[PDB]
Structure formats: C-alpha cells, structure tokens
Amino acid sequence: DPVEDIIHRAISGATNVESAADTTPSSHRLETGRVPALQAAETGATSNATDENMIETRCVINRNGVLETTINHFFSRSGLVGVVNLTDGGDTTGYATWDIDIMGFVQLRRKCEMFTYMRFNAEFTFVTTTKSGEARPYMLQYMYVPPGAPKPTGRDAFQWQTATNPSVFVKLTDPPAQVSVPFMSPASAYQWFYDGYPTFGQHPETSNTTYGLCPNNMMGTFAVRVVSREASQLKLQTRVYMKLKHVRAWVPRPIRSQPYLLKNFPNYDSSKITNSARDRSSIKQAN
Amino acid sequence: ETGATSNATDENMIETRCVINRNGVLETTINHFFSRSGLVGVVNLTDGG
Amino acid sequence: DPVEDIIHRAISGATNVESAADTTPSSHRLETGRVPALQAAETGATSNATDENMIETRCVINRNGVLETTINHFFSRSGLVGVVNLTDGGDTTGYATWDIDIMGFVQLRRKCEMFTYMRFNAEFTFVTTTKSGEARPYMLQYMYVPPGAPKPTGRDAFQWQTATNPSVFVKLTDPPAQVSVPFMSPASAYQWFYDGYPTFGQHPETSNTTYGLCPNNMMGTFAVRVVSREASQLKLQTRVYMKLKHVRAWVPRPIRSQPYLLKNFPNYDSSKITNSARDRSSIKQAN
Amino acid sequence: TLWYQTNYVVPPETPGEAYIIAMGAAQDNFTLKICKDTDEVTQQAVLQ
Amino acid sequence: SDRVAQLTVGNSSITTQEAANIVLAYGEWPEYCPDTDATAVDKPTRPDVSVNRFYTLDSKMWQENSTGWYWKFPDVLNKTGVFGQNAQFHYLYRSGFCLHVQCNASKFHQGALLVAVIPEFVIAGRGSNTKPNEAPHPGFTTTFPGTTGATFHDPYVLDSGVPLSQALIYPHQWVNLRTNNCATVIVPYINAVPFDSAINHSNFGLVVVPVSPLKYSSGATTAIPITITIAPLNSEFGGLRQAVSQ
Amino acid sequence: SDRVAQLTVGNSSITTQEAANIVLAYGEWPEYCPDTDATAVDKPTRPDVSVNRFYTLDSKMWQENSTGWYWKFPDVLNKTGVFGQNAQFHYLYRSGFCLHVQCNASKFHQGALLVAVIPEFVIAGRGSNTKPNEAPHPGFTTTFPGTTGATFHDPYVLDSGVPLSQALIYPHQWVNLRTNNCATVIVPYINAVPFDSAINHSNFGLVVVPVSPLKYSSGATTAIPITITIAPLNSEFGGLRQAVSQ
Amino acid sequence: VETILEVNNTTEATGLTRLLIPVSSQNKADELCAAFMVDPGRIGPWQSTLVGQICRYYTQWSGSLKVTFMFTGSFMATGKMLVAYSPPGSAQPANR
C-alpha cells in the first residue's frame, strides 16, 4: 500500500489407465484445412497423429493389460550386484570385504542407468558356496559396516562383536540369507550421474579422479568371515543378489550404447565406437 | 512503414514499479510558449538630418 | 502460503503552540527514587529537567509571542547576494555578466548554511546607480540566461532579442526592479553542502577542484547592458538583493566558525584558527 | 549501443550491404520546464 | 500469431519472428522452494530483477565440419553479472533457467541443429584403458568449460558413451533453417536436493549438435554464428560467506 | 534492563552489557521509497538478508594523543561484501544505516569519545590562499578514505571550519568509559533525491573524536582499540549496468 | 512523433547518407555496429530529431524516450541485432 510493486498450475495431469487404449470406427474425410498428418518435429513435441485420423479403422475394444510395464514391476527382478571371494586358509587373511556398489557389473547397471534419480528399498540375498560348488556345514558371518564404522582388521578382531553393526549368522548348508534394506541415502534420491566434485578447491587437469563421484551413494562396506578360532582351510565365494522394491524414478535418460570400461566412470574407447545398429548393404534393400 | 509511431510503452517492454507522477505538463502549452515577448522590429529616426 | 517467509509509526508528533510555555506552581519534595535533576548526557538526549521540578515556582501565564522565530520570518529579510560592475565606455566591452551564486559573500551565506537543505522561492531586487551614486535617465536591460542558453557576446548581439529568455527593461532613474522567482532546482531541495563529485572517473589527488560542486545549484547567468546603438561613456554598478520566501529547511547544522576564504569552498587557514570565544584570565574569575 | 547478435546473412546474388534507419521520440511521462531561448540559430545583422 | 513471440524478464527483452512455440521442460514451471521441501534454516535471499534476466554469451561460428558444442549452466554465469557475484558469496543455490538459442540463415541455406537440455550431463574419458588408476579423466576445463563452452570430439556418443539418437528423451527443440531461426526451452530446477552449491555442481548441460550439416552455394554468406541466451529464472541463494570462486 | 540490549539483522547479531539506550536519528525509521516519491521507473531490487547485516571494519588503536577519525558510509562498504557488489553494478542506491561504535576499557581508565552522524559532511582545504585557482583541495583519498578511514588534522574545527562544540546538533551519542562501552545510532536515508549513486556521493559521515583525552595509570593495559560496526538497513538498488568501481 | 535521427556524421556521407547506418556480413563475431549518447539536448544525433529541437527551448527534461530502428535491407536478408542502453557510470562498453 505504501509501495505497490511489493504486492505480487503446471500443464497436464495424470490419468489412471487400467488397460490399453481402444480404437473407434472412422470413415473417409474429404475437406480442407483439417490435417492430422502434417506435424512439426521442430517444436519438440511428438506427433499427436492417431490411428482413427489417418485411415479408416474398425471398433476395437482392447483387453490387453498394461500392468507389466510399470517401473515397479520392471525392477522387481533380482540381479547379481557383486561377488566376493573368501579364502580362510591362505596365509593370514581370514576375512573378505566388499564395498557396496551395484555398478559392479553390467545387466543391472544398464537398467538402473536409464533414470537419473531413483528412490527405493532393497532386498539382499546371499548365495554362498565352495569354489567346487559343494556345500559344507560351516557357519559364516555377514556383517554390514555403515560409513565411518571401523572395518575388521582380522578374523579375531573385536570388530566382530557387533553390538551395533547388524550381522547375519547362517550356516553354509542352509537356504540363502535374505534381508530388507531401507532407503539410506542422506539425500532424497539416489543419483547415478553426478556432474560436479565432492569438495571445493583446485581440480588438476592431469588426474581428475575426484570428478564424477557422488558421496550420497556411498553406503559403506559389507564384510564376511567364517566363525572359528582356528583358521579353516577352504576357498569360498559369495554371490549377492538384490531385489529392488518400492521404486520411484525421475527424469529418464538414454541407455548405454557402448561397453562399460570402468566401474564408477562412464568411460568408453573412442577408436572402437560401435555404431549401435547392424551394418547393411546400401539402402533401399531391406534384408 | 504504416506511418504510425510506436505504441510500445514502458510497462510492456520491461518490469517497472508503481510511479505516480506529479510533474506538471502546463508550461508546454502553445499558449504559454508564445507568452514571452520578443523584438519584431527596430526603426531609426533622425529628426535633424 | 506455499512458502511462509515471503509473508511480511515514527516516534513523536508535532504540536501547534501559539505562545511561549507557562509555569505551574510547585512545592518542596522530600522522598526517594524520584530525581528529575540526574540526567545522562551519554544517551544523546538533552536534559528533560524542567523548572517546576527543580525548585519552587509560582504560577506564571506567559503571553510572550513565539512567532518571530519561525524560519519563514527569519529569512523574510532581504540581503545583498551580488554586485556587478558595468562600464559601457571602456574599450569594447558593453555588457556585464554575473553567474548567479548567493554564496558570493558573507552575511546571507552564513545564515543559509545552518541548514543542509532548503526549498524556497525568491524575490530579486536590482538597485543600480553610477559609481558616483548619481542617477541619470538611461535605460538598462536585465536578461536572465538559464543554464544552456547562449550568453551575450557583445552589446549588439542577437542574444538580446529575448524571444524566450525573460528580460527586464527599466530606466535608471525609476524605482528598483523587482521580480519573483520560483523554485527552479531539478532536485527537490537546494543543498548547500554536497559531499561527492558531479561526474564519474578518476579524481586526482593534486587538483580536486571538481570536488564539492553540486550541479543542482547552478541556475545559470544574469546579464545586463545599456540599450543604445552607440557606446555610452559611463561607469555603473548593480547591487542585487533577494528576499527569500516560502522557505522550508531540513537537517540543521552548525554555523561557520571561521572566516570564509573562498566563494564555493569551505576552506579555512589552519594556522589562524580563531578559537571562537574570547580569551580570559585563568578560570574562576568571571570578568 | 547497437551490436550484432549473430550475423547478417544473405543468399547469393543479393546485395551484401544494407541500412538501418534510426528514429526517436518521447512517451507520455516525458515533460519539460523552464523555457529558455535556443542556441541553434544566430544572426549577424538585421535581415533586410 | 504462434510464430511471432516476445519474452521479457528483468530489464531484458527478446523478440522473434520465425520462432516455433516454446518448450516447457517436464511440464512444470520454476518455483521457489516450498516450506515443506526446505531444510536449511536461514532466510534465503531473492534478488529478482538484479539476477533474473537474459544473459548473452559469446557467439560460436558454425562451419561445415562443426562437431557441436556444450555448456554447463551454473558455471557459465558464475563469473558474469550480478548472478555470478551472488553465486560466489553464497554456499547454496536454486533456480530455473529460461533458455534461448539463435541461428539465422537465408532461405538458400540448409541444415539442422539439435538443442537439448540434458540434466546431470557427465562427460567421460576417451580411451581403451580398463585399469582405474591409469584410466584417462576428462580434464577440469573440459568438464566446466565456463562461458567459452567446449566442443565435442565425437558427438555421435555425446562424449557420454550414449547414443545421440535417443537424446530426444530430454527436453529438446530443433532449429531448422527452413522452419525456425531460434529454439527456446524453459527448465525448472531439478536435483535430488532443495539447494545445491553453484560452483561445485552443474545441474544440467546444453548441447547444440549439428545433426544435418551446414550446406549452401557459392556467393552466399559463409559466416553463420550461433548465439545462446540464458535467463536465470526465479533464483534463490543462501549460506552467505566470503567469496569462493573455485 | 535498559543497559543490556541485543540487535539482530541478517545473520549477524550484537550483544552489549553496558550500552546506554539507542539513538534513532530525526525520529524516523528507515523505509523503502514510497510510490509517490519514486521517480525512476525500473523495478528496484531488494536483496534483504544478503545486503542488510552488520559489517565490522578494521580497528583503530586509540592513543593518548589521538586526534580522532572519520568515515564515509556509502564508501566504506563499496568494496566489501555483497553490499559492495550490488553497489558497483547499480547506478542507483538508497538505504539507511544502523551504526554501532565499541570501545572497551577498565574502571581504572577515563576518557570520552563523541560519536556523531553528520550528513553531507564535506571536508575542506587547509591553507590561507584566497585565490581559487591556487587554493588547496583535500585530495581524493582524504575525501573518500574507504574502509581504513581518515584522521583529523585539527578536530576542533572538524576540518570543516565549523565548531565541534555545536556538533551536538547532529544525531550523536557519547561513549564514556565510566558509563557505557558502546554507542549506537540508527540513521534513516536522507538526501534531496529519492535515489543517488553510491560510488559518487557520500550521504553522511561518522566522526569519533576524543573530546576528553585518554588517561590511565602505569601497569594498566595500554592498547585500547576502537571498532565500528555498521549495518546497511532496508536497502534498495536500481539502474543495473556493468561494474563501475570508480 | 518519431523523427529521423542522424547517427552517421563523420566528415563523410554528404547530405542524406548521414541518416543511414550500414549493416553487412562480419567476419569476426560479436562486433559493434554503431553507438551514440542518448542525451537529446546534447550536440549530436538528436539535433536532427524534432524532439531534440523542442527540448532546446527548455532547460530541463524528465521522461522516458523511445528509439525505433527500421531495416531497409532486402526481403531475403536475415539477421539479429542487439540494441542496449547502459545507464551512466562508465564509457561505452568495449564488448557486448
């Protein structure tokens, strides 16, 4: 009132659609200035031309289900995020440690990298066996080590008392061990691509290895031993599978075209660029 | 080309505040513009020559 | 409502007082913790101790008038703001020019400089005479030359046609000429002290003569001639007096203690500092 | 100041140099005051 | 009617004859952070007209062999304007951007550019080395090129190892010399956090890649500059401290 | 109750035990410019928390012979802080200041300082020359000393040729070592114009002049610093352009 | 009312070429076409305008001014220009 200038939606909305879209009967049109076919791809909007407008269609009531394509059924499938090798007999050793990264290798990585942001819970399953595949009645310990907790320095270390760190004791002959994990990020979503640096300061142009790393994705360490006072002589391998549940995804992006060279980095080899397609004989002959 | 001057105003081009202008427009009327006297002629008279 | 923080007097008032304040009868007080005498000069507020509180007073109804001290009666008195010397006979010459500054000399300058800001109208009076004081029936022309108008280059110049510039034709034997002037500043008040520079750019530490000057105080030029085609032989002197009326004043300040050395600048001579007071014999003897 | 944002592009066989005419005026908040006499014109002597 | 258009923000204005509509990314407008989403307790500053306005960067000359260019937005504007000064004195940053790309050409020129806003755009190292310690990493000045921008080595993979054909899954617009002379896209603030540092993190990149190359006839104008104009929109700052530019 | 007090503005806070009240100059608060008083038509920017806050300058060491110091406010803050950056990028400026002067000392020290806010404070040249062309003029760095401040040659006339005894006609406060350890004054924006340039014009000066000198006994602490804290208050800016610092 | 404003002055252009300012294909990008100070009462471009002649009968002026640019090039020519106004405090900008 003393001064006036201090005195001062979206676009669309989501429709619940249980089944695929139907088709309605149409007939020939002859008239002017009505043209569903002509589009402008420059505007950045995809063609809104439908079936019914382009040619004559019948009445089709479509019963095909759309459910199986939801992102929450798309990640419901478990996959192998890591495999850790434990040899209790070799030299001293005695324990194995695996820093938790689900980028460890391909198939599940390539799925999760078609979205920039994902929030979700997880379910880990531990399939353990001998190098020979056989099972033997030895008890194992799986201890989870959140960021900042001291790592086990040996098989006899006091780290394994686990007054705080959650553990799983399971014999090797028993069914696999399975646990649920919440969403533990300090942020509001996991992000598989972070463009930026974790810290301030100088950034050399020789070795940038600090670049790209997002601290919000560091969940700490998973450790495993075999529980005895004397060192057993055996070799052992632990595969880790994870379902991914209660999932939400934001700002989708393209799939990886090129083979992955590194675990944490999206590097590729520029001489070998694959040209995702298959080569052909000229054009204007299709197979 | 139309021969009409630009009707673009302040408020349309950029963001402006609320200004209530008290400046007077009176002094620019043609009737105050010619109210000032001026020298239209000077005549030389010599009675003795 | 979506965000809260975007959702968001004086002290005293003026009393109309026609006459000086009265006095009300008081008597002795003996009690504790009521002390009008003790003040704190550190707070920056002047003592509010009155008569009635300090000692016993009678009932006095004061009829003395306060009117004569208003700023509008204080500047109602005319004063000499400039004097211009015109010799029409000497060499070529023929005209006199006086750039309008009311700081020209002292008495009126010292009054107006006890306020920082003054808005007012003015009334100029031109007293013209010969060097000998005598009056002779010659006609004079006083032309006012606003900022940016071309100045007269000679007695015969076309500048004197005055189709725009206001002029005053008056014979020398007639009563003085008198005119009213409005408030012509481009700002909202005249200001007698401007701390700053009129322009941007570099400011040498050798000659700063640009410093201190306020363009808003430049009203242009006042010119004078005597109207004839042939050059008269006489000497002439024009004193300019101005009443100052419809005056308003802001943020008062102290008077000049030291003699003025320059017209536009508040310079003084630091060896001669006057110590405004009169010297005395020790203390504890009053005259 | 008047700057080139991008460039001045012209097809082949068309003049490669052109002209911008410039113009000026005032708006409804524009005012003036303190009428004076202009300096644009001078006179050396009476005009017969 | 739809072709012609004019924007305005701050004291800056843009007019276009031949423009084709406007892209509003992900169907949402830029907004201030709501009270529920906020975390940091200090009162953020909202400069408005001093920050929000169009800034024009230096122009790129587009040549027959040009491979494309890219930028990082809370980078290009960190050293320029009043927006850049608030960004160096504040630890926290949020805003959306209104983006405009401009390329003129005659009706005798032909070609097409792909303008795209690609959030969290992470360039990659180029080499066959699989060992993580000896693997190449893409410089500092290649990651944050600043106002001058950087150019692709191999635009087909977008330096990200990802096919450019699928880049249409990002808010994008074509500038086609026969159709429109400019492209315009408004981007709301997106990130996993309500505020984020301006100097460390780059929310999104911009990619102008010449899909169909530039072609013309002898006698036509050879020099075809490309100019980008970006308006930080609905800005916020917080966490005041001494200036840190790096 | 009245002695103790705490200010707050922006992210900065000041607490005082021994303070004596607060001076509000000319009985008016700082305000934004009303619509009627405004002239320039652009929408001014109102940064608030980034600009309005307490800024502390370097400290002056007050010695037995000290003659006093002075400052110019839309000067000291032009090169420091976010306030200084807005001032260099904007042609127009308006704001009031909340001012605080601080001098500690023991109950065994004695002395008094006169703190005063003296609008349009114009220093003068010192010399006997009456000719305007050869007359001395007081330097650039003496007129706008910047953050470091300048000291009086002869405080009795305040370098203005005006008696210091009458300086009490200005908003002022004493800091008396036996009474209070700090002085505080709030100054509304005053000038003949609604906005004015920050780098050219200095609205008002501050004067700390040691009226009664500093005296103490052997064994007491010798070093007695004086520190000033100033909060630009209720700020406004306009006329955006490229940075001009001089 | 809008009136023809002279920008090109120099010693050249003779009579009527003073009204026109050239635009042409530039090799180096980001180049300055023309400039002038916007004070209408100052000797310069505004003397040819009829607003600039009428403000010389008056001491002071207040208000917003507008400048119009019309492009006389051929229909087949295209381009984009940036016209900017910089409030005081510095000389004309060196780069855009």
Ligand SMILES: CCCCCCCCCCCCC/C=C/[C@H](O)[C@H](N)CO
């Ligand atoms: C008893 C062992 C339980 C282990 C519980 C750990 C669960 C970890 C949280 C889910 C995984 C978070 C997503 C992983 C991020 C990425 O793989 C890397 N940190 C980034 O390269």
Ligand SMILES: CCCCCCCCCCCCC/C=C/[C@H](O)[C@H](N)CO
């Ligand atoms: C026929 C002659 C009429 C003359 C009318 C001129 C009136 C001038 C306006 C009143 C005086 C303005 C106050 C003067 C300012 C100061 O003296 C200096 N400019 C600053 O040093």
